[PDB]
Design a protein around this ligand. Structure first.
Ligand code: GDP
Ligand code: MG
Length: 404
């Protein structure tokens, strides 16, 4: 028996004015007829609030709803910049994305850019809604837009042959419900296309693995000497779990070493097991406090490795949001905040979206670049980091490819 329906995190991406917010409203309104959502008006979702987090401001609407199969958290954002920042900082988990493409316009530059970013930041799967079908009276033209979108997806290494594409009209489905449509399949053809979209989302976007089932990872935040037999390392477990008696690795800054966990402690609790989300103190056999420091991580052995050089997608903050007025440039050497500590690094090999070399990336823009750190640290694809100068965040990045 499953006590709770499965959960996924998704969002609407795509070019401005293609219909992302109207589709979000239509999904909540159609599912509200079944009792599975609070209906959210376009005007409400469109007026997305500001959210600030770790020095980065984004405008994001959040809606929740469920289908018969799965519960969803769904993000929608007003502007292209909001998507760039949300995807690079990972402010919303995206287990998949609904790409909205207007059938009247076809793919546009932010269609391409949002697919690029979805690939680079690791969004697993995409479903497409080909919106504004009411504006296109020729089935021939709709098939040509579908093929163009499949080719675009394939060019960013998504499986363009397998991605579900559902055509319809978010605006006509909302108007149909307003005019009395029941929300039952077969009652209205525009509502049926929203139901079909959510059937495809349910079937094609995988439910994420539970965090406690992934390989253990904990960033070390503080360290204590209490007995002569080991050091207590404290932090918040990011994923997985750790049990007394297990071998773990200490990764980053010094050569990788293994130790046995001989105790797990929380306030007023002596535990056999620490779980993802828990703030814990772990007793590490044989480790001296001098061997271990902030910036290191504890991990299931072999599950994460130390690295110094990687490709990343980087966003440069505008002065208005707390950054600097000056562009990032090759050989700039700022600080990289990697989970718990600054590491000096140098940036290089700026690569524009068309593959050509770039001279700089200006504030408010994003680009692919290479980072080389002065010291090795545990790095994996999808890891986020901040770029800092004097403790203020001036950029944000996500690891897209390990190089060394
Ligand atoms: N004809 C038509 N207009 C639509 C449709 N969906 C959205 N629109 C209109 O297109 C404009 C942009 O839609 P919006 O949802 O704000 O786009 P977003 O910028 O992608 O969030 C609005 O005026 C919508 O009413 C549709 O299916 N058909
Ligand atoms: Mg919108």
């Amino acid at each position: 028996f499953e006590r709770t329906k499965p959960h996924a995190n998704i969002g609407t991406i795509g070019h401005v004015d293609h219909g992302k917010t109207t589709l979000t409203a239509a999904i909540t309104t159609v599912l509200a007829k079944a009792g599975m959502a609070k209906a959210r008006a376009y005007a409400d979702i469109d007026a997305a609030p500001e959210e600030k987090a770790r020095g980065i401001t984004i405008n994001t609407a959040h809606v929740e709803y469920e289908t018969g199969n799965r519960h969803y958290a769904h993000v929608d954002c007003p502007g292209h910049a909001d998507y760039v920042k949300n995807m690079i900082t990972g402010a919303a988990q995206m287990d998949g994305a609904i790409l909205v493409v207007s059938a009247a316009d076809g793919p546009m530059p932010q269609t391409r850019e949002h697919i690029l970013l979805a690939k680079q930041v690791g969004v697993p799967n995409i479903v497409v809604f080909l919106n504004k079908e009411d504006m296109v009276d020729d089935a021939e033209l709709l098939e040509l837009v579908e093929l163009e979108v499949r080719e675009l997806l394939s060019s960013y290494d998504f499986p363009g042959d397998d991605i579900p594409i559902v055509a319809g009209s978010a605006l006509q489905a909302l108007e149909a419900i307003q005019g009395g449509a029941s929300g039952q399949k077969g009652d209205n053809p525009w509502v049926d296309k929203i139901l079909k979209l959510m059937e495809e989302v349910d079937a094609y976007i995988p439910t994420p693995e539970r965090e406690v089932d992934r390989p253990f990872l904990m960033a070390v935040e503080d360290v204590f000497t209490i007995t002569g037999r080991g050091t207590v390392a404290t932090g918040r477990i990011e994923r997985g779990s750790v049990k007394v008696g297990e071998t773990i690795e200490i990764v980053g800054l010094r050569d990788t070493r293994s130790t046995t966990v001989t105790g797990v402690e929380m306030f007023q609790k002596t535990l056999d097991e620490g779980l993802a989300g828990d703030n814990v103190g772990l007793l590490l056999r044989g480790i001296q406090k001098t061997d271990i420091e902030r910036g290191m991580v504890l991990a299931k052995p072999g599950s994460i490795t130390p690295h110094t050089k990687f490709e990343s997608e980087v966003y440069v903050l505008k002065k208005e949001e707390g950054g600097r007025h000056t562009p990032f440039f090759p050989g700039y050497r700022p600080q990289f905040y990697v989970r718990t500590t600054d590491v000096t690094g140098a940036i290089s090999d700026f690569t524009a979206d068309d593959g050509s070399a770039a001279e700089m990336v200006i504030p408010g823009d994003r680009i692919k670049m290479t980072v080389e750190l002065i010291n090795p640290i545990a790095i994996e694809q999808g890891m986020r980091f901040a770029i800092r100068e004097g403790g203020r965040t001036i950029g944000a990045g996500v690891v897209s490819k390990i190089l060394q």
